Amino acid sequence: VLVQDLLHPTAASEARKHKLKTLVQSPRSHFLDVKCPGCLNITTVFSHAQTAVTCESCSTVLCTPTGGKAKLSEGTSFRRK
Amino acid sequence: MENDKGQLVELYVPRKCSATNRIIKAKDHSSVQINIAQVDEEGRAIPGEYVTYALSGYIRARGEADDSLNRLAQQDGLLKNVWSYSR
Amino acid sequence: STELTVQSERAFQKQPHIFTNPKAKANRKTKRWYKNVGLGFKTPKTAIEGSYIDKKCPFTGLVSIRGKILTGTVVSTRMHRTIVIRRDYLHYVPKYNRYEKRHKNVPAHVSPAFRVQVGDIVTVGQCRPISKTVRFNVLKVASATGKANKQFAKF
Amino acid sequence: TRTSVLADALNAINNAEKTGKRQVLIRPSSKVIIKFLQVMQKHGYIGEFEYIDDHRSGKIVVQLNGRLNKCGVISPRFNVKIADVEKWTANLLPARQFGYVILTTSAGIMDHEEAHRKHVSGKILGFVY
Amino acid sequence: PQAKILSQAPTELELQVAQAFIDLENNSPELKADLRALQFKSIREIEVAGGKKALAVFVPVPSLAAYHKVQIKLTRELEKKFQDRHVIFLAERRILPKPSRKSRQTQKRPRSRTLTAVHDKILEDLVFPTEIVGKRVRYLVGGNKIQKILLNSKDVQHIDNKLESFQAVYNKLTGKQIVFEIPS
Amino acid sequence: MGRMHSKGKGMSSSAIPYSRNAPAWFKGSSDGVVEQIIKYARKGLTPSQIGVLLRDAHGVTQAKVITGNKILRILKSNGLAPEIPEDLYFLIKKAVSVRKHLERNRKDKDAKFRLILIESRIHRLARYYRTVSVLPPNWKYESATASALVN
RNA sequence: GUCCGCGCGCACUGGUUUUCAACCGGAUCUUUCCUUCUGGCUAACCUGUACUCCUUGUGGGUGCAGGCGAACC
Ligand SMILES: [Mg+2]
Ligand SMILES: [Zn+2]
Domain chopping of chain B, boundaries = 1-87
CA C1 to chain centre: 10
How many interface pairs between C and D have CB atoms less than 8 angstroms apart? 3
Rounded CA-CA distance F119/E96 in Å is: 47
Query: From start to end of A1-81, where are the E strands?
Result: 31-35, 42-46, 77-80
Tell me if chain D has a CB within 8 Å of the CB of B33: no
Say whether E131 and F21 touch across the interface (CB within 8 A).
Answer: yes
CA E151 to chain centre: 16
Within this chain, do residues D76 and D37 fall inside the same structural domain, yes or no? no
Is any atom of strand G within 7 angstroms of residue D114's beta carbon?
yes
**Which amino acid would we find at residue C112?**
P
Sequence-distant (6+) residues with CB within 8 A of F76 are C153, C155
Strands E178-181 and B45-55: unpaired
How many interface pairs between E and F have CB atoms less than 8 angstroms apart? 7
Instruction: Kindly give the residue spans of alpha helices, DSSP state H, lying in chain A.
Output: 11-16
Element (H, E) at B66: helix B65-75
Q: Which residue of C has its CA nearest to F74?
A: C155
Within this chain, do residues D6 and D57 fall inside the same structural domain, yes or no? yes
Within this chain, do residues D32 and D86 fall inside the same structural domain, yes or no? no
- For residue F92, being part of any structural domain is answered with yes
Per the structure, the complete domain to which residue D113 belongs is given by 69-129
Rounded CA-CA distance B78/B52 in Å is: 12
Is any atom of strand G within 7 angstroms of residue E15's beta carbon?
no
Choices 3.40.50.300, 3.40.1160.10, 3.10.450.50, 3.30.1230.20: CATH for B1-87: 3.30.1230.20
Within this chain, do residues F74 and F105 fall inside the same structural domain, yes or no? no
3-state SS assignment for residue D118 = helix
Tell me if chain A has a CB within 8 Å of the CB of D16: no
Is any atom of strand G within 7 angstroms of residue D27's beta carbon?
no
CB count in 10 Å sphere of residue D89: 19
Query: From start to end of chain F, where are the E strands?
Result: none
Say whether F20 and D54 touch across the interface (CB within 8 A).
Answer: no
Rounded CA-CA distance B53/B32 in Å is: 8
Taking the centre of ligand 1 as the mean of its atom positions, its distance from the CA of residue D32, in whole angstroms, is: 9
Element (H, E) at F64: helix F63-67
In our burial notation (b when 16+ CB lie closer than 10 A, e otherwise), range C48-64 reads: eebebbbebbbbbbebe
Rounded CA-CA distance B64/B57 in Å is: 11
CB count in 10 Å sphere of residue F49: 16
Rounded CA-CA distance E72/E30 in Å is: 13
In our burial notation (b when 16+ CB lie closer than 10 A, e otherwise), range E56-69 reads: bbbbeeeebeebee
Sequence-distant (6+) residues with CB within 8 A of D124 are D74, D77, D78, D80, D88, D101, D102, D103, D104
Within this chain, do residues D4 and D18 fall inside the same structural domain, yes or no? yes
Long-range (24+ apart) CB contacts under 8 A made by B23-27 are B24/B54, B24/B56, B24/B57
CA of D83 to C1' of G30 (A): 40
Rounded CA-CA distance A67/A54 in Å is: 19
CA distances from D115 to C55, D106, D119, D124, F130 (A): 56, 10, 6, 11, 45
**Looking only at Cα atoms, what is the longest distance across chain A?**
59
CB count in 10 Å sphere of residue F108: 14
Rounded CA-CA distance F111/F102 in Å is: 7
Within this chain, do residues D51 and D84 fall inside the same structural domain, yes or no? no
Within this chain, do residues D23 and D56 fall inside the same structural domain, yes or no? yes
Within this chain, do residues D56 and D103 fall inside the same structural domain, yes or no? no
- Select from D29, D48, D68 the last residue of a domain: D68
The angle subtended at Cα D28 by Cα D25 and Cα D33, nearest 5°, is: 85
Sequence-distant (6+) residues with CB within 8 A of E178 are E123, E146, E147, E148, E149, E166, E167, E170, E171
CA E95 to chain centre: 15
CATH number at residue F128: 1.10.287.10
Q: Evaluate whether C34 touches C48 at the Cβ level (below 8 Å).
A: yes
- For residue F21, being part of any structural domain is answered with no
**Which amino acid would we find at residue D71?**
C
A39 is in an annotated binding site: yes
Q: Report residue D85: phi and psi, to 5°.
A: -65, -35
Provide the β-strand partners of residue E179. E148
- For residue F101, being part of any structural domain is answered with yes
**Which residues in chain A have Cβ-Cβ distances shorter than 8 Å to D27?**
none
Strands E52-59 and E85-91: parallel
Domain total of chain D: 2
The string of DSSP codes covering E95-146 is ------TTS---S---GGGSHHHHHHHHHHHTTSSSPEEEEEEEE-TT--EE
Helix F109-131 to helix F86-104 angle (10° resolution) is 150
Q: Evaluate whether E166 touches E48 at the Cβ level (below 8 Å).
A: no
3-state SS assignment for residue D7 = helix
Specify the DSSP class assigned to residue F22.
P
Domain boundaries, chain C: 1-155
Nucleotide nearest to E92 in CA–C1' terms: G31
Domain total of chain F: 2
CB count in 10 Å sphere of residue A46: 23
Sequence-distant (6+) residues with CB within 8 A of B48 are none
Domain boundaries, chain A: 1-81
Rounded CA-CA distance E148/E178 in Å is: 6
Rounded CA-CA distance E21/E29 in Å is: 15
Order the strands of the A42-46 sheet from edge to edge. A42-46, A31-35, A77-80
Specify the DSSP class assigned to residue F58.
S
Element (H, E) at D124: strand D123-128
Q: Evaluate whether E161 touches E129 at the Cβ level (below 8 Å).
A: no
**Which residues in chain F have Cβ-Cβ distances shorter than 8 Å to A46?**
55-56
Provide the β-strand partners of residue E45. E55
Q: Evaluate whether D51 touches D59 at the Cβ level (below 8 Å).
A: yes
Task: Please measure the distance between the N-terminal and C-terminal CA atoms of chain C and give it in whole angstroms.
Answer: 37
Instruction: Kindly give the residue spans of alpha helices, DSSP state H, lying in D20-84.
Output: 31-42
Data resolution in angstroms:
4.0
Strand G interface, E 26-85, C-beta < 7 A: none
Say whether F133 and C153 touch across the interface (CB within 8 A).
Answer: no
**Which amino acid would we find at residue F33?**
V
Task: Please measure the distance between the N-terminal and C-terminal CA atoms of chain A and give it in whole angstroms.
Answer: 38
Rg of chain B over Cα atoms, rounded to whole angstroms, equals: 17
Where residue C54 falls (left for φ over 0; alpha for ψ -120 to 50; beta otherwise) is left
Rounded CA-CA distance D29/D11 in Å is: 13
We find that the CATH architecture of domain C1-155 is: Beta Barrel (2.40)
Where residue D86 falls (left for φ over 0; alpha for ψ -120 to 50; beta otherwise) is alpha
**Which amino acid would we find at residue F67?**
T
**Which residues in chain E have Cβ-Cβ distances shorter than 8 Å to D53?**
134-137
Within this chain, do residues D34 and D91 fall inside the same structural domain, yes or no? no
CA of E175 to C1' of G29 (A): 14
The string of DSSP codes covering C78-144 is -STTEEEEEEEEEEEETTTTEEEEEEEEEEEE--TTS---TT-EEEEEEES--SSS--EEEEEE--S
In our burial notation (b when 16+ CB lie closer than 10 A, e otherwise), range F91-106 reads: bbeebbebbeeeeeee
Per the structure, the complete domain to which residue F61 belongs is given by 27-81
- For residue F2, being part of any structural domain is answered with no
**Which residues in chain D have Cβ-Cβ distances shorter than 8 Å to E138?**
48-51
Q: Give the length of chain F.
A: 151
Rounded CA-CA distance F28/F34 in Å is: 11
Rounded CA-CA distance F22/E112 in Å is: 18
In our burial notation (b when 16+ CB lie closer than 10 A, e otherwise), range D113-125 reads: bebeeeeebbebb
3-state SS assignment for residue B62 = helix
Specify the DSSP class assigned to residue D129.
-
We find that the CATH architecture of domain A1-81 is: Single Sheet (2.20)
CB count in 10 Å sphere of residue B69: 22
Q: Evaluate whether E40 touches E18 at the Cβ level (below 8 Å).
A: yes
Is any atom of strand G within 7 angstroms of residue E103's beta carbon?
yes
